[model samples]
Target: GEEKMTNGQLWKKVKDSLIDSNIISGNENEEITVTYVNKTGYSSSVSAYGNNNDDFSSTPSNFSKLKEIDLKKDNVPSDDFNTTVSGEDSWKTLTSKLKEKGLVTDGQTVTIHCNDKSDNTKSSVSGKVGADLTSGNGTTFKKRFIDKITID
Candidate 1:
């Protein structure tokens, strides 16, 4: 017979296996240390120790490799210009405006920033726009979540 197992049960099975194999002591006071290296050049180390009330600690080393994004918005319209539209209408108007201004050129990527005044959180999406602004890939955040758009 077989049965589905929850995450907690699976974890307990592995922990028990390790202790039974002597790979780790069953004592709760023992300390375990783990280290990881990220492909982006960051490294982290974590350690857990203590008794029934265990303590855990982590330390990370930062690696600086800054790559500047060329946020191009030459001749882009002002943010206040599009505040009157709503929902899908706003997306339609924006795509049309982008096309009229010659900003949605073929093979060029455009970044759109949208602000929701109700919550004050900003979301952004970037993608390549078709020559006529009718087709493209990756242009979605503004269409579904934006309350106001500031072209950039």
Candidate 2:
């Protein structure tokens, strides 16, 4: 009999199971790595290594049967702050959160540090506070392959 599940479905199942067990949180900002192996011994073949959010179907290499699944959290910026937002809300969520915590204000320059493991590089981007310290597209900043974020 052939299995009907896709690799992406299997990955999501594993991820959700880990979350349900309190082993991991499904925060997109958090960096998670998943490794799959075929057997218990040292000779077990390494099947795949993927970020938590990766589309496993597109990874091209994966195990047909996984014997072990390893999950690891890379590194997150120590200066990171948390936020809660309402649906249909605009930049007010970010602005209010920052103001409530007295983090930043107008005329301040904020530096963002990003670590991208795909390229094995660490880089930074900065934005100056104007009349509105809002992102052009709501609360989401457009970036890719980010491992962590530090704001200063």
| lDDT, candidate 2, at 147 | 33
* Candidate 2, residue 46: lDDT: 21
TM-score of each: 0.25, 0.30
In model 1, the worst 10-residue window by lDDT is 65-74
Error at 119, model 1, angstroms: 2.5
Per-model tally of clashing residue pairs:
0, 0
List ranges where model 1 is wrong by over 4 Å: 1-92, 100-103, 131-152
For candidate 2, the per-residue lDDT at 149 reads 26
lDDT of 2: 0.36
Quote the positional error of residue 107 for candidate 1 in Å. 2.2
Model 1 reaches what TM-score against the true structure?
A: 0.25
Report lDDT (Cα) of residue 34, candidate 1.
27
Q: Pick the candidate with the highest TM-score.
A: 2
Candidate closest to the true structure, highest lDDT = 2
